[PDB]
Amino acid sequence: DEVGVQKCKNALKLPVLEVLPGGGWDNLRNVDMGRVMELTYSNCRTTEDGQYIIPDEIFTIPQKQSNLEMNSEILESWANYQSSTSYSINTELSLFSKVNGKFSTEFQRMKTLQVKDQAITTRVQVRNLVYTVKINPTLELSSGFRKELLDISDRLENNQTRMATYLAELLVLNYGTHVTTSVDAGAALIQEDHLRASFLQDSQSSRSAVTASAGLAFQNTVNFKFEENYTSQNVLTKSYLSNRTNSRVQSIGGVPFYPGITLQAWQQGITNHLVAIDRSGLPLHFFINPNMLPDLPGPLVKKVSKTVETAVKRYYTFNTYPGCTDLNSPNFNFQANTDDGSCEGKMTNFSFGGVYQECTQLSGNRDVLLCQKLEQKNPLTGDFSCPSGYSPVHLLSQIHEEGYNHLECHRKCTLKVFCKTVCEDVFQVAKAEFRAFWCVASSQVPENSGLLFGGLFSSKSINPMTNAQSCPAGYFPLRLFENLKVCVSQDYELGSRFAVPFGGFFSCTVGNPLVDPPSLKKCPGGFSQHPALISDGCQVSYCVKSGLFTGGSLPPARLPPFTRPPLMSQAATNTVIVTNSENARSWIKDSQTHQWRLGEPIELRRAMNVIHG
Amino acid sequence: DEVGVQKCKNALKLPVLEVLPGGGWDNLRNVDMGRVMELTYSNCRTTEDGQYIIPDEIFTIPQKQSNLEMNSEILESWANYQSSTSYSINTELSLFSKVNGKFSTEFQRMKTLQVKDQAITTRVQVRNLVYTVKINPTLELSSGFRKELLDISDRLENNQTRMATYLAELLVLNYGTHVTTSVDAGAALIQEDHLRASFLQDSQSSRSAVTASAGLAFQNTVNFKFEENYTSQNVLTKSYLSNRTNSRVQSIGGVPFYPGITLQAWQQGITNHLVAIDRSGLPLHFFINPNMLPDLPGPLVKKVSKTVETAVKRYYTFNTYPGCTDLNSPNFNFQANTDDGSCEGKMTNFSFGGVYQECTQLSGNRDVLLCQKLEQKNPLTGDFSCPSGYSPVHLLSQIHEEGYNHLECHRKCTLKVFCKTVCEDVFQVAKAEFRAFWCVASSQVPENSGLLFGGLFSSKSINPMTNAQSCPAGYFPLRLFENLKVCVSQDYELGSRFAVPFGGFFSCTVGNPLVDPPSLKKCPGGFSQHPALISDGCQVSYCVKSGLFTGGSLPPARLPPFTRPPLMSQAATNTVIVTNSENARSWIKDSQTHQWRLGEPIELRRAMNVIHG
Amino acid sequence: DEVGVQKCKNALKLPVLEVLPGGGWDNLRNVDMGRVMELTYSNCRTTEDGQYIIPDEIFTIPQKQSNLEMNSEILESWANYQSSTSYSINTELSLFSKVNGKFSTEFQRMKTLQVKDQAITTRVQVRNLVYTVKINPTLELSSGFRKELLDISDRLENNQTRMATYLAELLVLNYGTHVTTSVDAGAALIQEDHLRASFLQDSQSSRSAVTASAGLAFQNTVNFKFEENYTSQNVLTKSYLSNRTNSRVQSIGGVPFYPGITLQAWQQGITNHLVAIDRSGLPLHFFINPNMLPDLPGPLVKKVSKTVETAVKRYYTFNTYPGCTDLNSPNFNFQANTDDGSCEGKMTNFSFGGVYQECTQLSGNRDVLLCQKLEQKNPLTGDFSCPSGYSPVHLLSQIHEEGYNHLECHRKCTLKVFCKTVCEDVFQVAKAEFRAFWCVASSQVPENSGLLFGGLFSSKSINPMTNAQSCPAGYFPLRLFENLKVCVSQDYELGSRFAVPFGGFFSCTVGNPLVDPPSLKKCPGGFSQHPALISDGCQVSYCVKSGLFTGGSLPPARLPPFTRPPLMSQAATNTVIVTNSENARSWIKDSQTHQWRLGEPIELRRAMNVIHG
Numbered sequence A, B, C: 001d002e003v004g005v006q007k008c009k010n011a012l013k014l015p016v017l018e019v020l021p022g023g024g025w026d027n028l029r030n031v032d033m034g035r036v037m038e039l040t041y042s043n044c045r046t047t048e049d050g051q052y053i054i055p056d057e058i059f060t061i062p063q064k065q066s067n068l069e070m071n072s073e074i075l076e077s078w079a080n081y082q083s084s085t086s087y088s089i090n091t092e093l094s095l096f097s098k099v100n101g102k103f104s105t106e107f108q109r110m111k112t113l114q115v116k117d118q119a120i121t122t123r124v125q126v127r128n129l130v131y132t133v134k135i136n137p138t139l140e141l142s143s144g145f146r147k148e149l150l151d152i153s154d155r156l157e158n159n160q161t162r163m164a165t166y167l168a169e170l171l172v173l174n175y176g177t178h179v180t181t182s183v184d185a186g187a188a189l190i191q192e193d194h195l196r197a198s199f200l201q202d203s204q205s206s207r208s209a210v211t212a213s214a215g216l217a218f219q220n221t222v223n224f225k226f227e228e229n230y231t232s233q234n235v236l237t238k239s240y241l242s243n244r245t246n247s248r249v250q251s252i253g254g255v256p257f258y259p260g261i262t263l264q265a266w267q268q269g270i271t272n273h274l275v276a277i278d279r280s281g282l283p284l285h286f287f288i289n290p291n292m293l294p295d296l297p298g299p300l301v302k303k304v305s306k307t308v309e310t311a312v313k314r315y316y317t318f319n320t321y322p323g324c325t326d327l328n329s330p331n332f333n334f335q336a337n338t339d340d341g342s343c344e345g346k347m348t349n350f351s352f353g354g355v356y357q358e359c360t361q362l363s364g365n366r367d368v369l370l371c372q373k374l375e376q377k378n379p380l381t382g383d384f385s386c387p388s389g390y391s392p393v394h395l396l397s398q399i400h401e402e403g404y405n406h407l408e409c410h411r412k413c414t415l416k417v418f419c420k421t422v423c424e425d426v427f428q429v430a431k432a433e434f435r436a437f438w439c440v441a442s443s444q445v446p447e448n449s450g451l452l453f454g455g456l457f458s459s460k461s462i463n464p465m466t467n468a469q470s471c472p473a474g475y476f477p478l479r480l481f482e483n484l485k486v487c488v489s490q491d492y493e494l495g496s497r498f499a500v501p502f503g504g505f506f507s508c509t510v511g512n513p514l515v516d517p518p519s520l521k522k523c524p525g526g527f528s529q530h531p532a533l534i535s536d537g538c539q540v541s542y543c544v545k546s547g548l549f550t551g552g553s554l555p556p557a558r559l560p561p562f563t564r565p566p567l568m569s570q571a572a573t574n575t576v577i578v579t580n581s582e583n584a585r586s587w588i589k590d591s592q593t594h595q596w597r598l599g600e601p602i603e604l605r606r607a608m609n610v611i612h613g
């Protein structure tokens, strides 16, 4: 016998359509993930023209459509970005429609050419759509994707919410945020020039000559062999080249491009080299419903669907950077995705009144003393209070957990042979509540502000004013939530070399009050948001106006998981039996299912006991 | 043995006609959906000329018809749009005939070139109709489409109207609004130029020379190899090129176009590359009748047909944008489909008298307190009333539902072994009526208007004046129906930076009274409708005259479902049996169909009980 | 074994004649419908020259006839239209011979070029008739068409006239109005130029040079490769091109045309590419006679033949638009089929005396109150009467039906187990007679006319003065027959912006009396008929003289059904048996054909009872 795709290939002798829907899709990075739907090849289906083997649950639409532009299209801002290969799945109506595709390599290469070079972008393309490939609505889930939903399903039964939240975020690492429901199979040949923005500013009649020049250069590049056999029609073609900044040529599908392959010959190689030039989709929790999971109860597949909808929404929030996006404004935030709407600030210097953190031991007394290495007082008062010109603002209040360890051993001998030694090692969890506060200038008349620095570093982050996990010259750190150390000096002479303008803290629950004269958790205005660490799903951010914090390169996406699996109380024993003599036999029955077994002089049984919560 | 299409292909050795009717059709987006009719290949039927295998229920009409235009056609407005590939199914006589095709990529690309560039559109085409492919009227439904009508059918039996309405809208997501009953199989080669609208304004004798120039350029482009071997007959050909804005060339079916393929050679590749160049159809509820569903009762397939007719009609209503469509008017509404008939306004500034919302608890007392986080008072009075110069207008009155949770546990031991612990967790639904009102200037003499802002954001929407779910600088939100937060400030100095001209609210049941001096639910005039959230099938809209709300890009269609499945009252139990000893056996018979089973020391039975309504 | 066409193809190895008679034919749209006669291939018949397999009941006539015109033919009016592919079936002697073909795409493309461009039409063609293919008069009906006549036949037995009328109109949707009895198989190559009408007005000797120029251009276009190798004989050829408006070239059958295929080479591709270039036929009710239906009684196939003759005649009436057809007259009715004979009006302004509607409840008292939401009084009198200067005119009197609903439940318990609950839901039909009247100025001396508007909108129509289902600024609607809302204002200052000249109402039974000084139901003269809704087979029309109502595009045909199936009184029960205990068995015998069955704890029997009339 013979099964699968290869049974179809031997009977028909024709290839398989390589552009298939039903896979996962990361909609921030525009990459495709593991396979969510099930692909079966039982019925040996082909396309209606009889040239590709397709799966059973997939129907194709023949729309053998070719498009050719004699023009270009001008994109003078990176905010209204066109993806050119995943356009329909990014333009969906949602909360985070402005963040889709903003970590793609095709976007981040385009943004760094319009800012570095002060440029505008043109695009000419020859698109060749051959098939639309869709999924039948009566399709079932994949074997691997169903298994990982059932593992989330088990944790919701046992009331294990923190461990289900962890596994829901690993589903988004492996399967993305969306499922592709239709793909467009075809090829495309794309030109992408970058021109100086001064070259477009002439008129609205110059625009229709810039645009038809780029389409003329594209047809020369395909036809004329890199040589200067070009049909350069004007001086405007020659003036186009001198303002041109970058000029990439990209082939997507088909045969590889080289300058000189005619448009006829590129279109002969499209056959059997087809890629997805467009995609449509639905979010990942749409397909977690009682129809797809018929072997689970009704309200229990709605807990799985809600804990994955929360994990996808958490992934968009941690990759959102509001800031000033206008490159001509003086406070331009490079490394910012969303237009903050605050492009003109007032440059108000503020007073940093210091931080302090309370602690409250909940369990595990006289063993760890959690409320000693987790407690910080304000250097301006030496107390858990702000000074006279200040007022406290509550940042965040969570529970910290650490583990401590007992080790007990006793030895017993029986009939002067057969020494028994048991060694028990209990691991328990000690908890503590902390409440971190923060001081704000609310009296409007200080003499001196105090503590002139506002830069941070975590146990996993780096202070950018040192490029290390250290303080600058003459700075002492102040401990915060679990791992933050805020560098602080009140010297006013040796501290003013490294002192940055500080803007305020805010988190997912509280806002800073330095914007309104509750709060807004935006920014003061003119400053730039920068993230501190994440305290178990909540993000703490701080504002600053250096310019050193802003620039650099574009960061990659923060990938899940954003939490860690929690600590559990444990126990481990070690029983050793030592026979101190020959002429001493021993029989051991290890459990009720074992049989009687002749014993050995050294036994060494082991056991590890874990309790969840 | 061998079945299906491949039995036909082995005996006949000729391809299958790839252009088939009986599929679903979204008539707003002009895309085709899942298959509604059944395609069988039992009888090995071919076309009468013997070159394509066709299904059994489908007859073809040979009309081997070629059309060639020596002219063009001028389309100087996007209102009277010709689809060129789905023209006959969009031009049907209905209520929403002006909205068909208005979310297609071919329309939205054409509209954004006549507005951005102030252009007119010409089209030249060579169409090659080969077959008309129709359905026999005695055809039956598909296997997948019948299953999803039977699932709607089950919910109408059990008096589950909200869950049947939900499943009827997923039928429209998967199968569209129409069923194609005839397709035209063939190929087409289309030219589409955009010319400046000043170029056509000369006379009615210039029109017949603009038009015959575009047909001359199209024949040069197919014949002459991209080179300037053109037979440019006049200076009017040269003046045509300088007013030309875009110029796309599109091939639909056949071999891919390249400039230089002769018209002879393009017509040799039409064989075996045929697409649908035209379609006809009927609405989706036409095929839900007692003839197609013979295994269901008569009045029950009329409930299924009526609940799908309502879901299709709801889909056209939520994608209708009335507004000013004349691009020369100063209050031009980009992102508008339907001509509002109000292109000249009067610019009347109005008074925003504030909003307030009542609540009335219906069930679930002393558990949730729904009437506390769902209650809003008017800031101008501190009361559930409008001020002295105002009058209340009732927007909408619906029922809100939330869930609350009990957890009861008791433990029982029997004969000092066999500890039993049952943990019951009941989920109930608490309901509340809310009535949202709205104030209108009805006394005509205010001193100051009050509360100068009118922008909104939902739990799934974004305030465009912040590009976030937040208020602007110095604004406090007012809670409304379930998730609306209307940003409001009465400062008159720090609020006038962000204050927009407000026009009024209206919904599917009430109209605003700011048009007549019941109501009209149109607009005031000069303002632009913009949608707020959807409160369970009803759409709330608000009017504004910024210009920031209007422009941007064209939005995609709002796809179904527009409601959510309702909440149900639940129960979950957990019985645990713990044997505290060996020398203690146990036998368990789980149900009346099980056999007696030897018990284990830990059992952990589980149960989940759901009641619908 | 092997049956059908493929047995003939394997033994003979030659194609099947693809041009066959016996199909249905829509004579308004010139499209062909489902197959009415039966096509069998039992006897392996071929044509007498032995090149096509033909069915058994079909004889062919070899008339291998080629026609070539050296001239053209001039068609300076769209009234005397020549179809060029279905000419013999449109020119039949009947009442509606002037409406045949007037919704074809070939007509509606020609009419919109003689009106938009003020043009005349020329046509040159090379026709190649090969076979005449006819039906033997002893042929029987198809399997699908006989089944749908037997379903109409069943409804006439049971005295179900409204449901038979509905099914007779679905026969015309699926099978057209005619049956083709002979087709002409061949090919044709057609030229169709449009010339300005000023170019023909020189003399009757210029006509014979315009005509021979178009035939010379057609022979150049086939022979000379799109190049200017033309044998342009005169300056009259050059002057012909400058007055030319459109110039399409159409190939029907054969190989596809391209400019440059010689007339020799086009005629070599006619073999095996044959289409119907002409058709003859008979109406659809001709073939409903006791000979075609031998298994039904004599007078009962005359009821089927009469109810289909009425449905075809109703289809021509609803697609007839009388109006002014002369394009030079100032009151030109675009969107008009039939010459009204009233091309010069007098412009008489009339007085709109308002509408009022009576109601009379017939059955269903104290349940629906049909005579409350179906009653309208005249705003000029506040009464069911016209004012002093007016007189009432009765439009239409029909019966309205709505449904109401009872729901009764009672519960019964037996021996403290076995709870029985039956839930009965009766649906009844409430009827009401309405009589709609209309006021006419019959006293000739009014002071002011009153109620200055005359535009309508239905529940399925749109007011063109709003492009929506709404009133204009300052207008209140008046309810009419079932869904008409006539917009009305008597303000004379804010109403005169939207006030249209009103002409009168008329229906299929009454005429307006505004033409004679019974009635004529034509028009007043100068006005234009426009249809309101259809009240169960009767059409209500209204007259107006805007010019906004007239122009636009040509509408498609109104397709059947024009009625809906009527309401029926229903009943639905739900009996539930609940066993409240174990140790309680139950046996159930569901009917007299079932066997005894062991019962379940929850049963839930269901029943739906319908009575026709």
Ligand SMILES: *[C@@H]1O[C@H](CO)[C@@H](O[C@@H]2O[C@H](CO)[C@@H](O)[C@H](O)[C@H]2NC(C)=O)[C@H](O)[C@H]1NC(C)=O
Binding pocket: A196, A198, A199, A200, A202, A239, A242, A243
């Ligand atoms: C960038 O484009 C500008 C046009 O905006 C070019 O400036 C023109 O160059 C031509 C060529 O010598 C001159 O005749 C014009 O006087 C220049 N100015 C204007 C306003 O047209 C400029 O040369 C381009 N940059 C480079 C480096 O060539």
Ligand SMILES: *[C@@H]1O[C@H](CO)[C@@H](O[C@@H]2O[C@H](CO)[C@@H](O)[C@H](O)[C@H]2NC(C)=O)[C@H](O)[C@H]1NC(C)=O
Binding pocket: A205, B196, B198, B199, B200, B202, B239, B242, B243
């Ligand atoms: C757009 O079209 C207009 C015609 O309406 C062009 O204007 C004419 O151009 C010719 C060529 O030089 C002149 O001889 C005429 O005097 C111009 N005016 C008129 C009223 O004909 C115009 O040139 C075109 N636009 C561009 C950018 O070329």
Ligand SMILES: *[C@@H]1O[C@H](CO)[C@@H](O[C@@H]2O[C@H](CO)[C@@H](O)[C@H](O)[C@H]2NC(C)=O)[C@H](O)[C@H]1NC(C)=O
Binding pocket: B205, C196, C198, C199, C200, C202, C239, C242, C243
């Ligand atoms: C449309 O046809 C008329 C003929 O009726 C053309 O008018 C003649 O054109 C020639 C060519 O220059 C002149 O010699 C004649 O004097 C014109 N008049 C007459 C009465 O013959 C007219 O030119 C054509 N239209 C166009 C746009 O060319």
Ligand SMILES: *[C@@H]1O[C@H](CO)[C@@H](O)[C@H](O)[C@H]1NC(C)=O
Binding pocket: A159, B407, B425
């Ligand atoms: C699940 O465990 C948490 C832990 O505190 C508790 O608050 C909650 O009530 C538990 N729920 C159930 C249903 O056991």
Ligand SMILES: *[C@@H]1O[C@H](CO)[C@@H](O)[C@H](O)[C@H]1NC(C)=O
Binding pocket: B159, C407, C425
């Ligand atoms: C269906 O349930 C709704 C819920 O209130 C009720 O109003 C209606 O009467 C019920 N109808 C039937 C037939 O049970």
Ligand SMILES: *[C@@H]1O[C@H](CO)[C@@H](O)[C@H](O)[C@H]1NC(C)=O
Binding pocket: C159
């Ligand atoms: C058929 O039913 C109609 C309904 O009123 C009645 O008028 C007519 O007399 C009936 N005819 C026969 C033959 O029963």
